[PDB]
Design a protein around this ligand. Structure first.
Ligand SMILES: O=C(NNc1ccccc1F)c1ccno1
Ligand SMILES: O=C(NNc1ccccc1F)c1ccno1
Ligand SMILES: O=C(NNc1ccccc1F)c1ccno1
Ligand SMILES: O=C(NNc1ccccc1F)c1ccno1
Ligand SMILES: [Zn+2]
Ligand SMILES: [Zn+2]
Ligand SMILES: [Zn+2]
Ligand SMILES: [Zn+2]
Lengths: 360, 360
């Protein structure tokens, strides 16, 4: 049984469990069960399962060096898969809700869930709430007596909140902070003074790094009963660094990666997002260039979007990405070395995570 | 210190804790902290705090008959207040999201949160997610070492999921079940065959009774270390009965209670909700009356809404409400008697809950 295959098998299992429980304990009818089945498949499946599979890969590393009965090996792999699916479902939650929040059209080359004709926003908001509720239902059922349940729930909790706070930082990233006020409609920044590397780092640390890198790595440690193999401050530092780099790539692709390849039309420019491109541009531009960015950013007009893309093309941002990238490579390698003192095995799993991020 | 005063004092405390943590652990800036402060006050305050205060009232009943050091008494009351606020915040979550889902205009005589000029739907969806995340942050902080934490989290979890499932049942209550299909836009029922007392009971049991009555009563038991004072099947049965009755009242008020008194313009008729009125009407109407309901239900046109209200006025639904009410009174009194075998104290708290529901 290949690791991916085992992971996929567990989704089927978890899905059956969740739908069967709805029938036996929540009085659900078959048509609503089918609806939620489709909802779960449409929102949870179709990606690469990087986050889930990181939990499984960390657990598999420890299994290769730790002595266990066969049935214990299976139970740990099972737990890693269930934990992996908790992460995927927590992502599915955030994607459904964020697509609604942003008025997104496509995700992964298909319509966003809320756009399905028999869904609508009125249902999709609640479908997203269900998705995250499922994470907990999975955890309490599969992990009821596990010694790691407390620690797993507490971490999951913190990560979820970090992610929501990060969404708050992302959706407000084009406003001026001193003007935020629920009573007053928010103008887009005129000065772009909050488009800095530090502010960008804050948005990305909370919105993605905690759920994409920190939670899968630490969940793999927890299901393996291995959190003492590591210095946790190091695991945090390495997650935050790899995660930021992953977002920088995503920001580049939003602007430069053909829509068919991207699975959507990127709209970061129209949306005035605080992207690595905009930050990096503003960090090297002259006065005329800053002024021209300011005249054209955060507008749906295609001519204005195409002015911004041209400023980006001309400012030679490729050079800055290479330097950014070379620095993350230094730093990631450093942290991997430090991780090796206490756990070669875990260090190597971090190496794989990094390689999968760096080459894609 | 009156119980309400103590409850309110704890909101201030919890609020300060949450905002301070955002500053020391989540890198928040003051303007965003102010935004979330206002958000928390606007979405969490202004109601009667029935649900929160039930936790405090149950705990106070047990305190009057149980021996404890003074500092233990304070700690239990504190815990009950924190637990009460977890419920209020979980409600705040559902109200913010449901107002967005339904396109609601007003709540408690003020605009729904998403309608605030500096909020918008893009922020309010995420603000609602934060609200529920706060419930967990409160629980892990205040209850970290409590022997009841596991049981409290597991219950909270189940209730939250029940509530979401109940929202799914509510928002789909005007569709025909055999036509639910994410691919196909959903027509409103033509036959109203799913407007039955049993189907109505299912919607209400999950959408409101679990979070409004079951969770406050059981949380009061948990913070008191008293879950062995009770037969839990009885607590469930009494919660589900009082809760259904509370919703029947709310359904009546949606239609008949002046908007200034209601805090909003009820739109259950326009929305084709499966309300007690519609069910009860259909359960006694003749063929001509059914046909006239069918021609006029679930339409925004005020003349059609006023036809439905007149059918309701003429069908003498007051008589049916009195009979419904007299039956709940029999049944609630019965359950209260049964609760007295194991706990007079808890029975009496249930009596107060019922009296507060029945007279309002
Ligand atoms: O292919 C899938 N399910 N089929 C399947 C998976 C595992 C084990 C046995 C199977 F029949 C799949 C992809 C995503 N989720 O499930
Ligand atoms: O990447 C560069 N700048 N922009 C940036 C840095 C850190 C985080 C976010 C950022 F946008 C760079 C390479 C060489 N000089 O600047
Ligand atoms: O009046 C409120 N806060 N003032 C307050 C409350 C308790 C203790 C001392 C106080 F100064 C209130 C209502 C809703 N939330 O807080
Ligand atoms: O209340 C009555 N019917 N309607 C109903 C009953 C239980 C739950 C939901 C309902 F709408 C009633 C009183 C006397 N005859 O019918
Ligand atoms: Zn977004
Ligand atoms: Zn992006
Ligand atoms: Zn609603
Ligand atoms: Zn209502």
């Amino acid at each position: 049984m290949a690791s991916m295959e085992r992971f996929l098998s567990v989704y089927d299992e978890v899905q059956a469990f969740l739908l069967d429980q709805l029938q036996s304990k929540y009085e659900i009818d078959p048509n609503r069960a089918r609806y939620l089945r489709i909802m779960m498949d449409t929102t949870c499946l179709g990606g690469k399962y990087f986050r889930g599979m990181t939990v499984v890969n960390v657990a598999e590393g420890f299994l290769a060096v730790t002595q266990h009965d066969e049935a214990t090996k299976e139970r740990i792999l099972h737990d890693a898969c269930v934990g992996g699916w908790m992460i995927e479902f927590l992502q599915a939650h955030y994607l459904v809700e964020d697509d609604i929040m942003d008025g997104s059209v496509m995700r992964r080359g298909k319509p966003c869930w809320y756009r399905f004709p028999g869904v609508t926003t009125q249902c999709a908001i609640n479908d997203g709430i269900i998705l995250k509720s499922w994470t907990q239902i999975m955890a309490w059922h599969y992990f009821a007596d596990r010694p790691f349940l407390k620690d797993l729930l507490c971490l999951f909790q913190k990560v979820d909140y970090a992610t929501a706070v990060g969404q708050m930082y992302d959706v407000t990233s084009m406003c001026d902070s001193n003007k935020l006020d629920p009573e007053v409609a928010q103008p887009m920044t005129t000065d772009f003074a909050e488009f800095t590397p530090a502010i960008y780092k804050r948005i990305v640390k909370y919105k993605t790094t905690f759920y994409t890198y920190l939670l899968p790595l630490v969940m793999g440690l927890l299901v393996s009963e291995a959190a003492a193999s590591v210095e946790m401050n190091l695991v945090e530092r390495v997650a935050h660094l790899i995660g930021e780099y992953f977002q920088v790539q995503d920001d580049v692709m939003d602007c430069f990666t053909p829509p068919e390849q991207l699975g959507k039309v990127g709209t970061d420019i129209e949306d005035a997002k605080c992207s690595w491109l905009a930050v990096t541009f503003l960090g090297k531009a002259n006065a005329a260039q800053v002024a021209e960015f300011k005249a054209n950013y955060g507008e749906k007009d295609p001519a204005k979007v195409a002015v911004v893309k041209r400023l980006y093309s001309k400012a030679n941002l490729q050079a800055d990405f290479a330097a950014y990238e070379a620095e993350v490579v230094r730093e990631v390698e450093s942290l991997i070395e430090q991780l090796k003192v206490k756990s070669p095995t875990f260090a190597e799993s971090v190496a794989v995570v990094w390689e999968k991020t760096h080459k894609r």
